[PDB]
Amino acid sequence: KIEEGKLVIWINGDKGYNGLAEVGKKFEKDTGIKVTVEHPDKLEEKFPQVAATGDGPDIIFWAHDRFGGYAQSGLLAEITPAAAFQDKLYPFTWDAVRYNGKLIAYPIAVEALSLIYNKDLLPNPPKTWEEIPALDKELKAKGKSALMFNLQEPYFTWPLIAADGGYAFKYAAGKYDIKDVGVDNAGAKAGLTFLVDLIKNKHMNADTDYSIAEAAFNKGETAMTINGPWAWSNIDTSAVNYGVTVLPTFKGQPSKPFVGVLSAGINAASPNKELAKEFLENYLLTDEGLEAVNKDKPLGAVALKSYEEELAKDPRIAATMENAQKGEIMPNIPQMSAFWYAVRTAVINAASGRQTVDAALAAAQTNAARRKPSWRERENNRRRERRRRAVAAKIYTGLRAQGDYNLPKHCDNNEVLKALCVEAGWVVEEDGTTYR
Amino acid sequence: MKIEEGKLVIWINGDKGYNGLAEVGKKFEKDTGIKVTVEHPDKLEEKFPQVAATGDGPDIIFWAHDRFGGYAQSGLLAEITPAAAFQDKLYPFTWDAVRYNGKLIAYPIAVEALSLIYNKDLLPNPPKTWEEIPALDKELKAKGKSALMFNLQEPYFTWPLIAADGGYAFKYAAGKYDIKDVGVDNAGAKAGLTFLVDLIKNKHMNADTDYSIAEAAFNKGETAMTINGPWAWSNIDTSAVNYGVTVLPTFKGQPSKPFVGVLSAGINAASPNKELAKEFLENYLLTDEGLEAVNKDKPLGAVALKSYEEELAKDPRIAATMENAQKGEIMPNIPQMSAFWYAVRTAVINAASGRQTVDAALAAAQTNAARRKPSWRERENNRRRERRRRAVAAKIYTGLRAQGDYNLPKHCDNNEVLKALCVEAGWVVEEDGTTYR
């Protein structure tokens, strides 16, 4: 739990938390405030469960798509940087972190998936998804594979699902229609069927996850992977000469990745809200601060204009933003969580053969729509059934006490009910068949 | 995933040397042409029993021996059939660790015991007792450091202190463990966990500290001590910290008693590669060169293979490891061990957080660790009984609604039908169900 004078940060384990820990240390030396960085598992899920009761970190790092629900549940302290600060960042990165007219976190970096390839195994990477199967057949004869990427998180498969028409929630009339979903249309089916066919034809394995794909590419066992800017440092430490380029087209259309804006929201329950902005505004979001983090694990197109003009000249960043322009920024609405869980279930269930593509995406469409019942709705149901059981229990208590039925020493209420039935002129068979 | 004929898939925990093991796999593929894939998924010791029940899961699974008895009872492991010649190459007691109902159910790899790891430059003379840690931490804090940080989310790391003054898991008597004789709630266990919660109350430790927080703190020089196993040394070596490995401190003048694990490799019962897995484990991994490749990635501890252990035993860090092991006990491998671990993990976490008193947390742990897990058939019995109870009721009300003519509204629940029936039989029923003649 939070406490005054200290700063605890939650950031995903694939970002440069060590580099950010070097930001907190210099922050500690200036004003004497200790700064701990922790990279817990499923931090995007734990934070909403714990922040309600007042627990959780001072600052939470995650992509912007989750912050709308967080704010909707009143977990985030509203951000109000001076004008002088707001102008230090690109406008569209402020838009990613504004929900109902209010800024709900500090945008940090823009992330988009790209195609990463091994130049030594594949000097000329494919321009199309359609030619990957043949390429894998050629590489399988050399003991390699064409492509491996995380199939457990729909983030990585969404570029292909959206290529031919799939979409999450249609945007029209300046709003996201929380009830117009595009996970079941012809384009989505085409994209997921091709992915499943890749598995069926043994060009990919349904159980490949982030760790398995990263190891295979960094050990030179697979020619390509799909990943974000954070993955680059680990490829750098390996012996692989890699390139970063546009994702392959599918049916002649670009892959359309969902673009995220890594952000840092301040816990509404924190006693260090001011201390946290002094850290975020004048220590992290500075050339030397982003540098220390970026040097750990690349951030992507950092939102600070001041440092992005430097990073923007990296050909890997140019490629990252080439993919981003062909994709879309993620909505931040609270229903993204339901959308992501549903599509995750669809991809996994179709990849494994547990469901057909048609059945998986059909269910996904209705799941990404589902309303989650409120606490009060759950409590209404709990109480109604408590009252139903209490009413029955009182009836049978009086029947047992006053009925003087010929009942066994121990018997259930069904037997009492039977004795009440015969008294009222009914016949009740062994199995409950009841008539006059 | 299913395991395919002609390929080998291995599961091993992420803190072990899976990169070294993958190199052994790459040699095996070079000599016989069989591809070997090594993965380190999360919660593998829980995932395996779920998938392997239907023939899924890996060909080979690595874990400490304590979980394998439950696997074998569930029929998930092949029986290990090493010729006597090969058995003689490993220490007898390591075979004991993987013997269950008289059969060998895994290949023992290495013996693991927790030790005290300390920063020589911050603390040239490590403490001999737990009792002096609070004072030592008070010194270190004045310099911006802490005395001790270790994993408080896995009971494995706190058990040495719980066991020190008398806590125990299952009592051994007459050549077997008594699954109803649990010792997580006696005076010694209470004293050990109380001292740990007292560390937390006096701000000498954080209740939320997990494995990665403690490892980062020690390896960065923020804390003078940690508690960990041999797997952790390689990350320390790469750090600036100059460390030593020594005996765990005493508690109430008595040695800490870590539970000792034997890293073991089981063969999935559903694998058609049982012969290939046996070949790989016997003739590639459990060799000098095989264990060396893994050990160089992350230290294994005291390996079961006599020939290579005579080399590793020269290491003072292994001598210390086995000094702690002698003071501890080999874990049981009985199926009830997972229930014991879940119970103590909840007790430690709840007490460390103040959610429960020590007495309450451990009282619940004792009941949970001793609770008999109902069989599948007992569960099915209960499920069918309640299915039948509802069915009889349903038929009774179906008949009452059909032939009753109780003048009831379009839709109404069974309680209202019951009420009508009661008045038909000469009863009065109030709104809340109060019923009488």
Next chain:
DNA sequence: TTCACACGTGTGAAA
């Protein structure tokens, strides 16, 4: 050991 009612949420109505 078996057993019965409690328990809160699921599924599907009915509006």
Next chain:
DNA sequence: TTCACACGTGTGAAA
């Protein structure tokens, strides 16, 4: 939207 019986397991009685 509210509502009701289904659902399998929990708590604890009787033996």
